[PDB]
Amino acid sequence: ADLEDNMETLNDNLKVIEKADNAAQVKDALKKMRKAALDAKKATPPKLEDKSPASPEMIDFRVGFDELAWEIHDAAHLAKEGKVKEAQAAAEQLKTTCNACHQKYR
Amino acid sequence: ADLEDNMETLNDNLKVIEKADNAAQVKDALKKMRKAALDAKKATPPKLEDKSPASPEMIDFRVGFDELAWEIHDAAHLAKEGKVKEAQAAAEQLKTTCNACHQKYR
Amino acid sequence: ADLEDNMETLNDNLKVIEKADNAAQVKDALKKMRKAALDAKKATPPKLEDKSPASPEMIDFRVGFDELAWEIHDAAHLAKEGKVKEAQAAAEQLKTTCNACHQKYR
Ligand code: HEC
Ligand code: HEC
Ligand code: HEC
Ligand SMILES: [Ca+2]
Ligand SMILES: [Ca+2]
Ligand SMILES: [Ca+2]
Ligand SMILES: [Ca+2]
Ligand SMILES: [Ca+2]
Ligand SMILES: [Ca+2]
Ligand SMILES: [Ca+2]
Ligand SMILES: [Ca+2]
Ligand SMILES: [Ca+2]
Ligand SMILES: [Ca+2]
Ligand SMILES: [Ca+2]
Ligand SMILES: [Ca+2]
Ligand SMILES: [Cl-]
Ligand SMILES: [Cl-]
Ligand SMILES: [Cl-]
Ligand SMILES: [Cl-]
Ligand SMILES: [Cl-]
Ligand code: NI
Ligand code: NI
Ligand code: NI
Ligand code: NI
């Protein structure tokens, strides 16, 4: 998928998680987020398209999705132990990782 | 190890997992797969050797091993909870990630 | 943070883990290690600054931090199951991954 579609998937599933009623719904949404994070890692964002493909900025962009995938994995750990409310709160905390990348490159 | 040896390790351990008799055998095989996936990420495949080192294709190649490592990690989660048959079925499902990369670059 | 500060964070938390008295202290230290490993992945080490940004050596450097992050994650798994002594021993085993990168690039 392209970068914009992966971002919608990320945004839509944050809300799905917030409103989820059970562990399986949070787990499923978090799995879609991880898939979208890894897929976004393949793109060149518009504001970096003039940079070289392995410029420090493009490396920082790609590693941002590794950081997001690891944070998603911690939240998924909580959902798999059945700690649904703690997983929902960890998911909402993802926004600081979202924001950090946005402030630099979006 | 070189790319071809990492692929054999991946292929051989898929079969080891299929025939495994207990959780520890699946766990051990999945750990060897993850190690091989990360090691393969360092290579340039023959059909991409004319591309630039951070070309979209080489990025897509390397991220494919992140996707495989994450899918392996989900299967390993199942083996560590003792759900041996579910882990064996998740391992067989890895083939769709194997195939997707192969269809593009092998 | 810069590469040198991320390495200190890695070194300091290995010792924190060795002397830890409970699971939460090991968990917290391992989380700081993962964060530092991913952050170090954004740097160019001095001995590679003449290489091209996606040279095989820079790829090998960056993938070394993926390998370290995955090994840290296995240790964290043990700390979250309450197997504190096994997690402490896994952490000390990280040194062979530290050493392998150092022998090549530091
Ligand atoms: C960098 C490593 C990023 C991370 C982590 C996240 N996002 Fe992102 N996002 C990024 C860029 C460079 C862009 C611009 C894309 C473009 O083509 O202009 C975006 C965009 C979005 C959007 C807007 C999508 C649209 O309709 O055009 C949304 C809604 C969005 N991003 C959400 C989002 C969330 C919820 C994240 C964390 C879970 C997140 N992003 C991470 C770069 C990066
Ligand atoms: C890209 C991201 C890949 C993923 C994921 C997997 N493989 Fe692969 N494989 C890839 C390439 C580019 C090649 C060609 C290597 C070459 O030098 O020609 C291969 C090759 C194989 C082989 C053949 C090895 C040989 O004897 O020459 C096998 C048996 C193989 N791959 C298996 C395999 C499995 C089981 C995977 C998932 C678990 C898998 N590969 C993933 C690229 C990629
Ligand atoms: C490559 C993939 C590395 C891994 C994994 C680890 N380290 Fe490292 N380290 C690396 C380099 C290239 C350098 C040189 C940095 C420089 O600017 O010269 C280092 C350095 C250190 C240091 C010295 C820091 C200082 O005071 O200058 C320490 C104490 C250190 N590294 C520790 C360390 C530990 C404990 C690791 C595993 C947990 C580890 N490093 C991994 C490259 C890489
Ligand atoms: Ca839009
Ligand atoms: Ca649009
Ligand atoms: Ca609800
Ligand atoms: Ca609700
Ligand atoms: Ca062959
Ligand atoms: Ca051959
Ligand atoms: Ca058998
Ligand atoms: Ca059998
Ligand atoms: Ca120093
Ligand atoms: Ca110094
Ligand atoms: Ca102590
Ligand atoms: Ca002690
Ligand atoms: Cl996950
Ligand atoms: Cl790269
Ligand atoms: Cl990467
Ligand atoms: Cl794993
Ligand atoms: Cl971890
Ligand atoms: Ni895509
Ligand atoms: Ni190798
Ligand atoms: Ni895990
Ligand atoms: Ni930094």
Short mmCIF file of all heavy atoms in Angstrom, two decimals, chain B residues 11-41:
data_model
loop_
_atom_site.label_atom_id
_atom_site.label_comp_id
_atom_site.label_asym_id
_atom_site.label_seq_id
_atom_site.Cartn_x
_atom_site.Cartn_y
_atom_site.Cartn_z
N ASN B 11 14.54 -22.97 4.89
CA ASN B 11 13.78 -24.09 4.33
C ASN B 11 13.89 -25.33 5.22
O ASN B 11 12.89 -25.99 5.50
CB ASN B 11 14.28 -24.39 2.91
CG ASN B 11 13.26 -25.17 2.09
OD1 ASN B 11 12.09 -24.81 2.03
ND2 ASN B 11 13.71 -26.24 1.47
N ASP B 12 15.10 -25.63 5.70
CA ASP B 12 15.28 -26.84 6.50
C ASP B 12 14.51 -26.75 7.81
O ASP B 12 13.98 -27.76 8.29
CB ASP B 12 16.77 -27.06 6.79
CG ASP B 12 17.53 -27.46 5.55
OD1 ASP B 12 16.88 -27.73 4.52
OD2 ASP B 12 18.77 -27.50 5.61
N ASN B 13 14.44 -25.56 8.40
CA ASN B 13 13.78 -25.46 9.69
C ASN B 13 12.27 -25.43 9.59
O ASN B 13 11.58 -25.83 10.54
CB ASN B 13 14.32 -24.25 10.44
CG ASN B 13 15.60 -24.57 11.14
OD1 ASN B 13 15.59 -25.25 12.15
ND2 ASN B 13 16.73 -24.13 10.58
N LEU B 14 11.72 -24.96 8.46
CA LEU B 14 10.29 -25.14 8.23
C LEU B 14 9.90 -26.61 8.32
O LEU B 14 8.89 -26.97 8.94
CB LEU B 14 9.89 -24.59 6.85
CG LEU B 14 9.51 -23.10 6.73
CD1 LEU B 14 9.01 -22.79 5.33
CD2 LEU B 14 8.49 -22.69 7.77
N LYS B 15 10.71 -27.49 7.72
CA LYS B 15 10.43 -28.92 7.78
C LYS B 15 10.65 -29.47 9.18
O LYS B 15 9.85 -30.29 9.65
CB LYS B 15 11.31 -29.66 6.77
CG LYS B 15 10.94 -29.37 5.33
CD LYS B 15 12.19 -29.28 4.49
CE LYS B 15 11.93 -29.77 3.09
NZ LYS B 15 13.22 -30.06 2.41
N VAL B 16 11.72 -29.04 9.85
CA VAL B 16 11.94 -29.45 11.23
C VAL B 16 10.72 -29.11 12.08
O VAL B 16 10.26 -29.92 12.90
CB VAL B 16 13.22 -28.81 11.79
CG1 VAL B 16 13.28 -28.95 13.32
CG2 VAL B 16 14.45 -29.45 11.14
N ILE B 17 10.17 -27.91 11.88
CA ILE B 17 9.01 -27.52 12.66
C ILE B 17 7.82 -28.43 12.35
O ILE B 17 7.09 -28.85 13.26
CB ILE B 17 8.67 -26.04 12.41
CG1 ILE B 17 9.69 -25.16 13.13
CG2 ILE B 17 7.25 -25.74 12.89
CD1 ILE B 17 9.71 -23.73 12.65
N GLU B 18 7.61 -28.73 11.07
CA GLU B 18 6.46 -29.54 10.68
C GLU B 18 6.48 -30.90 11.38
O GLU B 18 5.44 -31.41 11.81
CB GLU B 18 6.44 -29.72 9.17
CG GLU B 18 5.24 -30.51 8.67
CD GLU B 18 5.47 -31.12 7.30
OE1 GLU B 18 6.12 -30.45 6.45
OE2 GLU B 18 5.02 -32.26 7.07
N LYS B 19 7.66 -31.49 11.51
CA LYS B 19 7.83 -32.81 12.08
C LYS B 19 8.16 -32.78 13.57
O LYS B 19 8.47 -33.83 14.13
CB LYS B 19 8.94 -33.57 11.33
CG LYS B 19 8.73 -33.65 9.83
CD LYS B 19 7.44 -34.37 9.50
CE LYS B 19 7.25 -34.54 7.99
NZ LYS B 19 8.25 -35.46 7.38
N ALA B 20 8.14 -31.61 14.21
CA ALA B 20 8.58 -31.54 15.60
C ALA B 20 7.62 -32.27 16.52
O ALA B 20 6.42 -32.35 16.27
CB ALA B 20 8.72 -30.09 16.05
N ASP B 21 8.17 -32.81 17.61
CA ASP B 21 7.40 -33.57 18.59
C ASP B 21 7.12 -32.82 19.89
O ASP B 21 6.36 -33.34 20.71
CB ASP B 21 8.12 -34.89 18.93
CG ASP B 21 8.13 -35.87 17.77
OD1 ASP B 21 7.43 -35.66 16.76
OD2 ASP B 21 8.88 -36.87 17.86
N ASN B 22 7.69 -31.63 20.11
CA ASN B 22 7.48 -30.92 21.37
C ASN B 22 7.80 -29.44 21.19
O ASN B 22 8.34 -29.01 20.17
CB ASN B 22 8.33 -31.51 22.50
CG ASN B 22 9.80 -31.53 22.17
OD1 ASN B 22 10.42 -30.49 21.95
ND2 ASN B 22 10.39 -32.72 22.12
N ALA B 23 7.48 -28.66 22.23
CA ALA B 23 7.59 -27.20 22.13
C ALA B 23 9.03 -26.75 21.93
O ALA B 23 9.30 -25.85 21.12
CB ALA B 23 7.00 -26.54 23.37
N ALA B 24 9.97 -27.38 22.64
CA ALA B 24 11.37 -26.95 22.60
C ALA B 24 11.96 -27.10 21.20
O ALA B 24 12.78 -26.27 20.78
CB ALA B 24 12.19 -27.75 23.61
N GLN B 25 11.55 -28.14 20.47
CA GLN B 25 12.06 -28.34 19.12
C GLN B 25 11.56 -27.26 18.17
O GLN B 25 12.30 -26.81 17.29
CB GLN B 25 11.66 -29.72 18.61
CG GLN B 25 12.50 -30.84 19.17
CD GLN B 25 11.87 -32.20 18.96
OE1 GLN B 25 10.78 -32.30 18.39
NE2 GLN B 25 12.55 -33.25 19.41
N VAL B 26 10.31 -26.84 18.33
CA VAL B 26 9.76 -25.77 17.51
C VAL B 26 10.43 -24.44 17.86
O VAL B 26 10.86 -23.70 16.96
CB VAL B 26 8.23 -25.69 17.69
CG1 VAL B 26 7.65 -24.48 16.96
CG2 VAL B 26 7.58 -26.98 17.20
N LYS B 27 10.52 -24.13 19.16
CA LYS B 27 11.22 -22.93 19.62
C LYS B 27 12.62 -22.84 19.04
O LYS B 27 13.02 -21.80 18.50
CB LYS B 27 11.32 -22.93 21.15
CG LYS B 27 10.09 -22.44 21.87
CD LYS B 27 10.33 -22.38 23.39
CE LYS B 27 10.00 -23.70 24.06
NZ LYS B 27 10.15 -23.65 25.55
N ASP B 28 13.40 -23.91 19.17
CA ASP B 28 14.78 -23.89 18.69
C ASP B 28 14.83 -23.65 17.18
O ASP B 28 15.66 -22.87 16.70
CB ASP B 28 15.48 -25.20 19.05
CG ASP B 28 16.91 -25.25 18.57
OD1 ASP B 28 17.74 -24.48 19.08
OD2 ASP B 28 17.20 -26.08 17.68
N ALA B 29 13.96 -24.32 16.42
CA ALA B 29 13.95 -24.14 14.97
C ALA B 29 13.55 -22.71 14.60
O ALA B 29 14.15 -22.11 13.71
CB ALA B 29 13.02 -25.15 14.31
N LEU B 30 12.55 -22.15 15.28
CA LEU B 30 12.13 -20.79 15.00
C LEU B 30 13.24 -19.78 15.30
O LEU B 30 13.38 -18.78 14.60
CB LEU B 30 10.86 -20.45 15.78
CG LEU B 30 9.56 -21.09 15.26
CD1 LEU B 30 8.46 -20.94 16.30
CD2 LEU B 30 9.13 -20.50 13.92
N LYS B 31 14.03 -20.03 16.35
CA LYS B 31 15.14 -19.14 16.66
C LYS B 31 16.20 -19.17 15.57
O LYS B 31 16.76 -18.13 15.21
CB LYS B 31 15.76 -19.50 18.01
CG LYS B 31 16.88 -18.53 18.43
CD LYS B 31 17.30 -18.74 19.88
CE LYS B 31 16.51 -17.84 20.81
NZ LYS B 31 16.88 -18.04 22.24
N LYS B 32 16.48 -20.35 15.02
CA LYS B 32 17.41 -20.42 13.91
C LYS B 32 16.87 -19.70 12.69
O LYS B 32 17.63 -19.11 11.92
CB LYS B 32 17.73 -21.87 13.55
CG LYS B 32 18.32 -22.70 14.67
CD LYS B 32 18.50 -24.13 14.16
CE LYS B 32 18.77 -25.12 15.26
NZ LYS B 32 20.15 -25.03 15.78
N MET B 33 15.55 -19.74 12.49
CA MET B 33 14.97 -19.03 11.36
C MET B 33 15.14 -17.52 11.50
O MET B 33 15.53 -16.85 10.54
CB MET B 33 13.50 -19.39 11.21
CG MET B 33 13.31 -20.85 10.75
SD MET B 33 11.60 -21.27 10.38
CE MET B 33 11.41 -20.49 8.77
N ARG B 34 14.85 -16.98 12.69
CA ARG B 34 14.99 -15.54 12.91
C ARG B 34 16.43 -15.09 12.66
O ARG B 34 16.66 -14.09 11.97
CB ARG B 34 14.57 -15.18 14.35
CG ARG B 34 14.51 -13.66 14.62
CD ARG B 34 14.18 -13.36 16.08
NE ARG B 34 15.32 -13.49 16.97
CZ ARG B 34 15.24 -13.63 18.29
NH1 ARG B 34 14.05 -13.65 18.90
NH2 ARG B 34 16.35 -13.73 19.00
N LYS B 35 17.39 -15.83 13.20
CA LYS B 35 18.80 -15.52 12.98
C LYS B 35 19.13 -15.50 11.50
O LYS B 35 19.84 -14.61 11.02
CB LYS B 35 19.66 -16.55 13.73
CG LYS B 35 21.16 -16.42 13.50
CD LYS B 35 21.89 -17.53 14.25
CE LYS B 35 23.37 -17.58 13.91
NZ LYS B 35 24.13 -16.60 14.73
N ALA B 36 18.61 -16.47 10.74
CA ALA B 36 18.90 -16.53 9.31
C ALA B 36 18.22 -15.39 8.56
O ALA B 36 18.80 -14.81 7.64
CB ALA B 36 18.47 -17.89 8.74
N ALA B 37 16.98 -15.06 8.94
CA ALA B 37 16.28 -13.94 8.32
C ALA B 37 17.06 -12.64 8.49
O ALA B 37 17.25 -11.89 7.52
CB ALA B 37 14.87 -13.80 8.91
N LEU B 38 17.53 -12.36 9.71
CA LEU B 38 18.27 -11.12 9.93
C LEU B 38 19.59 -11.13 9.17
O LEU B 38 20.00 -10.11 8.61
CB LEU B 38 18.51 -10.91 11.43
CG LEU B 38 17.20 -10.76 12.23
CD1 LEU B 38 17.43 -10.72 13.75
CD2 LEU B 38 16.46 -9.52 11.78
N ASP B 39 20.24 -12.29 9.10
CA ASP B 39 21.50 -12.39 8.37
C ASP B 39 21.30 -12.20 6.87
O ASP B 39 22.13 -11.57 6.20
CB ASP B 39 22.17 -13.73 8.65
CG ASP B 39 23.64 -13.72 8.33
OD1 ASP B 39 24.38 -12.92 8.96
OD2 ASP B 39 24.07 -14.49 7.45
N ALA B 40 20.21 -12.76 6.31
CA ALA B 40 19.91 -12.57 4.89
C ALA B 40 19.69 -11.11 4.55
O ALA B 40 19.93 -10.69 3.42
CB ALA B 40 18.66 -13.37 4.50
N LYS B 41 19.23 -10.33 5.53
CA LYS B 41 18.96 -8.91 5.34
C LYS B 41 20.22 -8.13 4.97
O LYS B 41 20.13 -7.02 4.44
CB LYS B 41 18.31 -8.36 6.62
CG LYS B 41 17.65 -7.00 6.54
CD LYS B 41 17.09 -6.62 7.93
CE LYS B 41 16.51 -5.21 7.90
NZ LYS B 41 16.23 -4.62 9.25
#
